RNA sequence: UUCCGUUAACGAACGAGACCUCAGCCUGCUAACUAGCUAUGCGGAGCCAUCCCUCCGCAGCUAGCUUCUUAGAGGGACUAUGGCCGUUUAGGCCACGGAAGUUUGAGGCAAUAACAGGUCUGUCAUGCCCUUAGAUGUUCUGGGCCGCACGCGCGCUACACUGAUGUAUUCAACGAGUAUAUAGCCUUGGCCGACAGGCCCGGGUAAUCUUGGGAAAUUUCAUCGUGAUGGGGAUAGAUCAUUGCAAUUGUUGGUCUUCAACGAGGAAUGCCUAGUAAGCGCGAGUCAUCAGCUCGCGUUGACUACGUCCCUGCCCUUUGUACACACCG
């Protein structure tokens, strides 16, 4: 459409396609209104329910790096990490690293979960489905924490750690913390079905 | 990797990264970063952040130096 | 007969753009907007430029000044100030239908370019270090 | 000019400039001090006495009536008191004193009545030339 | 060596602005001093 | 003969204070003086925070006391005896005025 | 070998769970649009949301 | 290029490691810390980007000279760690093994004297006016 | 217990709300050489240089200046408008508009009845008792309140590479400043010193001088490269200066050295829903000096949820009671 808007001016949002029509609504990459130059924005989100569903996906992945106390409150470092990871994804796959981000989030969102329902007067955990927004929430969180701990006390630095996790989760291989936790949750829920 | 403690051992300053190891390490995708490959060529940093300087005057690859000294790689063009 | 001096605001940062009918020039505290110095938030400063384009700036000079605030607050205040200064200059000196296109280009991407953000660091109450938290509580 | 030049590369260029554009005297305690009480090591660069002077050149450039204490404060930083909470700690006096005295001895800056340090016109000439000679 | 102007005790003083009265005397007489408590 | 005079004027209460401000401005402008004011000068906020308990028991509760001191300044160009022709009109309770002779 | 099947949430009936944390919704199947089933859903879910669904023939019961 | 690359140098009875920077290997000696290592490197005028292991023999002699006779280098009195002695009264840098002997001389004065501090050490508890309800 | 409405009740009184303070909007009004734009006039420096153009300096009978700053009066939101639900009542959910659509955000104040809640150690507030000269009265000296096998509570520093160190870069807000004598509380400026801190000229009872707060985090370039390392700064020695009439059981601050535990913490448990948590610094209180604390202030700035009565509790109704000091019955 009208898409002469590239994040960091150099990674075209155009020609990115989401596989899940389920997460199509909740991934902010498609509409001409969801394109942004930078994954930093002083958005008045969380002021209302579901308003985060229209947060830019890159921004809503950016907010999840800045965690564990020493890193709380500093988005400039987070967006710097995002920039370096995003360019290194390109420097390996030579394909739209935006599409890499999106496809990884598709392929690492738990589709079923076992929680603690009670019925008939008796409470015991059972399997339930996962609404797509919480799909995305867990995807973001669970891809990110893998990079955090896999780069902790490690000379490999966070940009390349998170790049490894993204490239390999999007590729689909079970070599990432993310997709390893995915099928673990999936199998606990399948057993408890 | 013990890669700044091993900086003066003559193997590194003689043949290892003098386009014998990090000539083929970039070649996996034809461009694989020096900071990414800090562990694919397991050799860690500052015996590596200096050999990147050596390879830039040796004129074999392009350079991108930025915030946390995130530096990169490109094999031949 | 162009001269407009329009402001934009953030937490405490205030940005004021005083203008001339000049050629293309844009300066923050004498330093070109090219040298705005969060070098990851260097997009947002050019973003009102990058949405309108230099073509809407071949007749204007902006000696924009910024005081108070922090760093990102000041940058977002730049963004608001230049956006509103362009809209006001167009409205009063070009055409209202002409500024309406600027209105819609800016607002389609985001509303926060033109509308101030009413958020402030709300005060801290006793019984804790923090405006909403408390001290850790011990029973035994 | 210097407001058009990236604030870092101008410092680099001027640091080289007040090396090769003649010479001056220099104290024989430069390779000892920490330049601040909260610091832990002396500067890792050798010509830090020159990069410092390049920075303090443009300070009096773009601001007037600056005393020694103003530079003490501007060049302080975070002091990590150990197990105590960290604070803000002002920098050293003698280092800034000798930077200002050196620049005065080349007549780049000079002490103003009503107090403070102000640039001179030929120092302005020099800073603008070295600014223009940067990409 | 310094006490309240009001009760002449040695703790809880309010030295600021030169009151020389303790935290208790100060509240007890605060409204007539003029410390309107808008918040 | 015609000299320059300052009047500074402070208080605790805005409603009381502004009545005096309108008073002197109209007092001057009935007699056509060269006046400028009343410059409004930022409010001082005296504040003392106190533990409202007298013995230190129960949940820690503080109360914040504050005075607001308001400052106003006006310049007049007239002789000081002409000034005393004005500043004998009634002055409202609580307001303070400190006419001084300036350059 | 179940092929994961899709549904849209036509209305959110309620919010069951001991801690009130499992939305109970009523889904309509995309692949054949006359099958409507009451399921349990966790997290924020609104009307018109498309849900992937691994195993289809399970359904919940009113106020489960 | 470590034709004679040394893994441990063994100056001053510490086995100074020959694998880390000379900047922060000379700190392994008990009596020379981070700052005084730098000042010695400066005054002995040795190349800075130099891992111990590659360094040459004449300049260990230079470090020897500048660590046992630092003062003659016009270095001020106030890097030195035995400022204004009361055994004699000079200004010297104590080095690896002698530091414990010097500390024993201090505490051993304190023992002979019956100083509160000397007892407090002999008693074992904190010596500098600290609380001891809840720490130590 | 807000209202509609029902109605052996009618009509009322508090609490809620209403009220006040701060914050958010106003190119609308009042103004402001103790605020700041704007223009011109010269100056300085860069320059197709000769003018122009860019950035600074200084001043005014420059404003047919108040947008930025301040502070007064005001204006503004009312669910007002539309859709849907609802007896189409009370209202709710949604949408445009708008600065604001959880009363817009946060507080202040805050009812009846009570507690053997705390305070006789805030008080020439106090009843009764004790003491009342060889004093539990007052003053002084020295010590003590800080002692340490240990257990607990609030906290600070971390366990690092999303880092530490060393350069460069530059951004606030809240407030604070006795005749304090021979310049003296905040201290600008010059000088000496590596530092600590000294000397001299002074400024300010303050939008005037401090400070137009030149804060840090963060940003940038290198140094360390996974190692209890350059993380950590505990401990301890040497010495230097300031506050003090006095520094010892080191007041504090420097300088060199000494370089511990701590590999993200068991059972358990706390705080938190938007500029909020958390990270980061400043100011005030205390103060002759000592701030890891407390109260304020801003800076950067999120994940999650928009629910439920499962845990702990609260309010109403019904029901049961062998309880009333009330289930700790
Ligand atoms: Mg890392
Ligand atoms: Mg309220
Ligand atoms: Mg009682
Ligand atoms: Mg006594
Ligand atoms: Mg005690
Ligand atoms: Mg507490
Ligand atoms: Mg350290
Ligand atoms: Mg203090
Ligand atoms: Mg206390
Ligand atoms: Mg609890
Ligand atoms: Mg009974
Ligand atoms: Mg019982
Ligand atoms: Zn009292």
């Amino acid at each position: 459409p009208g898409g002469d808007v590239k994040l960091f001016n150099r990674w075209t949002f155009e020609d990115v396609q989401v596989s899940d029509i389920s997460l199509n609504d909740y991934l902010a990459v498609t509409s001409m209104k969801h394109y942004t130059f930078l994954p930093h924005s002083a958005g008045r989100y969380s002021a209302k329910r579901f308003r985060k569903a229209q947060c830019p996906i890159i921004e809503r992945l950016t907010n999840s790096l800045m965690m564990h106390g020493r890193n709380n409150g500093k988005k400039i470092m987070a967006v710097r990490i995002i920039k370096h990871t995003m360019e290194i994804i390109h420097l390996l796959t030579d394909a739209n690293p935006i599409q890499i981000i999106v496809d990884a989030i598709i392929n690492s969102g738990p589709r079923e979960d076992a929680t603690r329902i009670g019925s008939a007067g008796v409470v015991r955990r059972q399997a339930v489905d996962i609404s797509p927004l919480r799909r995305v929430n867990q995807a973001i969180y669970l891809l990110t924490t893998g990079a955090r701990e896999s780069a902790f006390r490690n000379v490999k630095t966070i940009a390349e750690c998170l790049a490894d996790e993204l490239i390999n989760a999007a590729k689909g291989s079970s070599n990432s913390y993310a997709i390893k936790k995915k099928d673990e949750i999936e199998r606990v829920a399948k057993a408890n079905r | 990797g013990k890669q700044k403690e091993k900086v003066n051992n003559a193997v590194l300053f003689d043949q290892a990264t003098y386009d014998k190891l990090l000539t083929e390490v970039p070649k996996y995708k034809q461009i694989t970063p020096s900071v990414l490959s800090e562990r694919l060529r397991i050799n860690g940093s500052l015996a590596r952040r200096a050999i990147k300087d050596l390879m830039e005057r040796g004129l074999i690859r392009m350079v991108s130096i930025h915030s946390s000294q995130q530096i990169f790689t490109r094999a031949t063009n | 007969p162009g001269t407009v001096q329009c402001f934009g605001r953030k937490k405490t940062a205030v940005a004021v753009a005083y203008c001339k009918p000049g050629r293309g020039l844009i300066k923050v505290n004498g330093a070109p907007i090219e040298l705005i110095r969060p070098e990851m938030l260097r997009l947002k400063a050019f973003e009102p430029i990058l949405l309108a384009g230099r073509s809407r700036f071949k007749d204007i000079d902006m000696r924009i000044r910024v005081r108070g605030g922090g760093k990102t607050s000041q940058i977002y205040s730049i963004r608001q100030a230049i956006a509103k200064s362009l809209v006001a200059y167009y409205q009063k000196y070009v055409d209202e239908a002409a500024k309406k296109e600027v209105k819609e280009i800016f607002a389609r991407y985001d509303r926060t370019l033109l509308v101030a953000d009413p958020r402030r660091c709300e005060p801290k109450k006793f019984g804790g270090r923090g405006a909403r938290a408390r001290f850790q509580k011990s029973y035994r | 000019t210097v407001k058009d030049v990236n604030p870092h590369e101008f410092v680099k260029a001027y640091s080289a400039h007040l090396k090769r554009s003649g010479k001056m005297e220099l104290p024989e305690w430069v390779d000892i001090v920490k330049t601040a009480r909260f610091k832990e090591l002396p500067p890792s660069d050798a010509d830090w006495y020159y990069i410092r002077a390049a920075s303090m050149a443009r300070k009096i450039y773009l601001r007037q009536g600056i005393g020694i204490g103003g530079f003490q404060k501007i060049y302080g930083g975070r002091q990590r008191n150990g197990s105590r909470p960290p604070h803000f700690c002002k920098s050293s006096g003698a280092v800034s004193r000798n930077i200002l005295q050196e620049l005065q001895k080349m007549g780049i800056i000079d002490v103003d009545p009503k107090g403070g340090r102000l640039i001179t016109s030929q120092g302005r000439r020099d800073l603008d030339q070295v600014a223009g000679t940067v990409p | 060596s310094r006490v309240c102007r009001v009760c002449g005790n040695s703790h809880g003083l309010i030295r600021k602005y030169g009151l020389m009265c303790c935290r208790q005397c100060f509240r007890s007489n605060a409204k007539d001093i003029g410390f309107i408590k808008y918040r | 003969v015609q000299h320059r005079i300052r009047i500074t004027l402070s208080s605790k209460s805005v409603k009381n204070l502004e009545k005096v401000c309108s008073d002197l401005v109209k007092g001057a402008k009935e007699k056509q003086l060269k006046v400028k004011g009343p410059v409004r000068m930022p409010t001082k906020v005296l504040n003392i925070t106190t533990r409202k308990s007298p013995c230190g028991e129960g949940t820690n509760t503080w109360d914040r006391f504050e005075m607001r001191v308001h400052k106003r300044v006006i310049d007049l160009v007239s002789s000081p005896d002409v000034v005393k022709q004005i500043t004998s009109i009634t002055i409202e309770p609580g307001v303070e005025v400190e006419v001084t002779i300036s350059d | 070998d179940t092929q994961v099947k899709l549904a849209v949430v036509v209305k959110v009936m309620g919010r069951t769970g001991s801690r009130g944390q499992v939305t109970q919704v009523r889904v309509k199947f995309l692949d054949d649009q006359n099958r409507l089933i009451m399921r349990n859903v966790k997290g924020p879910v609104r009307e018109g949301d498309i849900l992937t669904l691994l195993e289809s023939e399970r359904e919940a019961r009113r106020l489960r | 290029a470590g034709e004679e690359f040394q893994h441990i140098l063994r100056v001053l009875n510490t086995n100074v490691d020959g694998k880390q920077k000379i900047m922060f290997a000379l700190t392994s000696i008990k009596g020379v810390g981070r700052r005084f290592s730098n000042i010695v490197c400066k005054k002995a005028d040795i190349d800075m980007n130099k891992r111990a292991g590659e360094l040459s023999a004449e300049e260990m002699d230079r470090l020897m000279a500048v660590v046992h006779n630092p003062r003659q280098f016009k270095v001020p009195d106030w890097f030195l760690n035995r400022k204004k002695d009361y055994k004699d009264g000079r200004f010297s840098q104590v080095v690896s093994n002698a530091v414990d002997m010097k500390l024993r001389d201090d505490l051993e004065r304190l023992k002979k004297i019956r100083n509160h501090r000397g007892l407090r050490h002999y008693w074992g508890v904190r010596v500098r006016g600290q609380h001891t309800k809840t720490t130590g």
Side-chain angles (χ1 to χ4, degrees), chain B residues 7-59:
Chain B
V7 70
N8 293 140
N9 313 132
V11 176
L12 183 63
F13 270 45
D14 196 14
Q15 71 275 17
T17 62
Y18 293 98
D19 48 322
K20 181 266 289 181
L21 293 171
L22 294 174
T23 187
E24 190 276 331
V25 175
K27 280 166 182 177
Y28 292 103
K29 305 223 169 191
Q30 199 189 4
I31 64 165
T32 54
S34 303
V35 177
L36 185 150
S37 179
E38 296 294 328
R39 297 292 181 90
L40 301 176
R41 173 66 273 173
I42 309 191
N43 291 287
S45 304
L46 185 73
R48 199 91 177 271
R49 187 167 20 85
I51 63 171
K52 182 67 181 294
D53 292 331
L54 276 296
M55 300 156 150
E56 292 295 328
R57 64 90 173 174
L59 291 176

Side-chain angles (χ1 to χ4, degrees), chain D:
Chain D
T1 63
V2 65
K3 295 246 163 203
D4 291 331
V5 65
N6 182 329
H8 291 171
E9 288 56 62
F10 163 76
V11 162
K12 281 55 181 183
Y14 202 72
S15 78
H17 190 308
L18 75 164
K19 291 178 70 68
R20 67 185 184 273
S21 66
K23 181 68 176 177
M24 72 292 291
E25 60 88 19
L26 188 153
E28 183 65 26
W29 60 270
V30 64
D31 313 333
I32 278 166
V33 298
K34 257 194 285 189
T35 188
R37 63 182 293 166
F38 59 92
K39 299 293 183 182
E40 185 175 2
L41 282 72
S44 179
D45 192 355
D47 61 326
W48 70 267
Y49 189 65
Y50 292 163
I51 296 170
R52 178 67 66 192
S55 178
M56 311 180 60
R58 83 185 272 189
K59 299 293 183 182
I60 296 89
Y61 180 85
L62 61 83
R63 179 66 178 86
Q64 293 82 17
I66 298 169
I68 193 66
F71 273 102
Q72 284 181 161
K73 185 183 287 185
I74 191 167
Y75 280 124
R78 192 176 73 161
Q79 175 197 6
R80 294 178 66 188
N81 287 355
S83 68
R84 285 86 170 94
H87 292 89
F88 175 76
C89 194
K90 68 181 178 67
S91 66
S92 84
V95 176
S96 297
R97 187 180 297 276
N98 295 114
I99 300 298
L100 310 196
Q101 293 180 357
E102 181 208 277
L103 295 185
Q104 188 274 331
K105 181 68 174 67
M106 283 74 74
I108 301 299
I109 62 170
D110 62 357
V111 176
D112 189 359
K114 73 181 56 83
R117 318 242 180 191
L118 282 71
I119 205 77
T120 61
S121 179
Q122 78 81 10
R124 180 66 179 269
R125 178 133 301 185
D126 291 331
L127 294 174
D128 283 345
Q129 285 288 114
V130 65
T133 78
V134 176

Side-chain angles (χ1 to χ4, degrees), chain G residues 2-55:
Chain G
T2 48
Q3 169 263 336
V4 298
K5 291 174 70 175
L6 277 296
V8 296
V9 160
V10 298
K11 67 181 181 180
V12 160
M13 292 180 183
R15 195 72 163 299
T16 302
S18 60
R19 283 82 59 85
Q21 62 84 30
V22 161
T23 307
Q24 64 183 357
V25 299
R26 184 176 177 86
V27 298
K28 184 178 184 292
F29 273 78
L30 275 294
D31 44 46
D32 58 356
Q33 292 193 348
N34 75 31
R35 193 145 64 90
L36 186 87
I37 299 298
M38 183 177 176
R39 296 293 299 273
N40 308 133
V41 166
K42 182 175 73 175
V45 57
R46 36 193 299 290
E47 293 82 3
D49 291 331
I50 296 90
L51 279 165
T52 183
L53 186 153
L54 282 72
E55 189 277 332

Side-chain angles (χ1 to χ4, degrees), chain A residues 22 26 113 126-127 129 131, chain G residues 39 42 44 49-50 58 64:
Chain A
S22 160
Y26 292 166
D113 186 74
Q126 65 182 357
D129 288 84
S131 65
Chain G
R39 296 293 299 273
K42 182 175 73 175
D49 291 331
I50 296 90
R58 297 201 317 131
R64 205 186 181 185

Side-chain angles (χ1 to χ4, degrees), chain A:
Chain A
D4 204 3
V5 173
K6 278 74 69 177
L7 61 82
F8 301 91
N9 290 319
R10 185 269 303 279
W11 285 322
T12 186
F13 284 73
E14 296 295 328
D15 298 2
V16 65
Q17 293 179 356
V18 64
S19 66
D20 289 332
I21 62 170
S22 160
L23 266 69
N24 181 324
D25 270 349
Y26 292 166
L27 295 175
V29 304
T30 62
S31 65
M32 65 180 288
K33 66 182 290 294
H34 291 171
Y35 306 115
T36 196
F37 295 67
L38 185 64
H40 186 273
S41 72
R44 180 66 180 270
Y45 292 162
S46 84
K48 187 179 289 293
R49 185 177 180 179
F50 284 100
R51 179 137 316 161
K52 65 178 73 175
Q54 288 69 241
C55 182
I57 192 66
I58 302 299
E59 183 178 1
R60 187 175 184 270
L61 188 153
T62 305
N63 294 8
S64 296
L65 293 175
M66 64 180 288
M67 293 177 70
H68 285 55
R70 66 181 181 179
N71 292 345
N72 266 347
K74 63 178 71 66
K75 199 153 173 181
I76 301 299
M77 185 180 288
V79 65
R80 188 269 298 164
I81 296 169
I82 301 299
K83 182 178 183 292
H84 293 313
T85 70
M86 186 64 72
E87 64 200 41
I88 190 167
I89 305 288
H90 186 273
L91 190 153
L92 279 71
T93 61
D94 291 331
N96 290 327
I98 299 298
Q99 188 274 331
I100 300 299
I101 301 299
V102 170
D103 190 358
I105 302 299
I106 300 299
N107 282 9
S108 178
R111 291 87 55 89
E112 184 178 2
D113 186 74
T115 187
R116 173 162 199 121
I117 298 89
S119 64
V122 167
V123 63
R124 182 68 274 172
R125 65 160 190 220
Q126 65 182 357
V128 303
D129 288 84
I130 301 299
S131 65
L133 188 153
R134 187 180 167 85
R135 184 138 189 201
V136 183
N137 300 349
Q138 306 303 153
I140 301 299
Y141 177 93
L142 187 151
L143 281 71
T144 300
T145 61
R148 179 169 317 93
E149 319 197 26
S150 175
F152 194 119
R153 68 180 66 252
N154 203 10
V155 181
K156 185 182 286 185
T157 187
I158 189 65
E160 292 82 3
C161 193
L162 186 134
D164 291 331
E165 283 206 310
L166 298 178
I167 62 170
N168 176 317
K171 183 63 65 68
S173 178
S174 176
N175 260 332
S176 178
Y177 179 113
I179 191 166
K180 293 187 286 185
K181 298 298 293 295
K182 183 178 184 293
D183 63 358
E184 294 294 328
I185 317 304
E186 294 293 328
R187 186 177 65 247
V188 174
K190 181 176 173 66
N192 291 138
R193 186 178 287 165

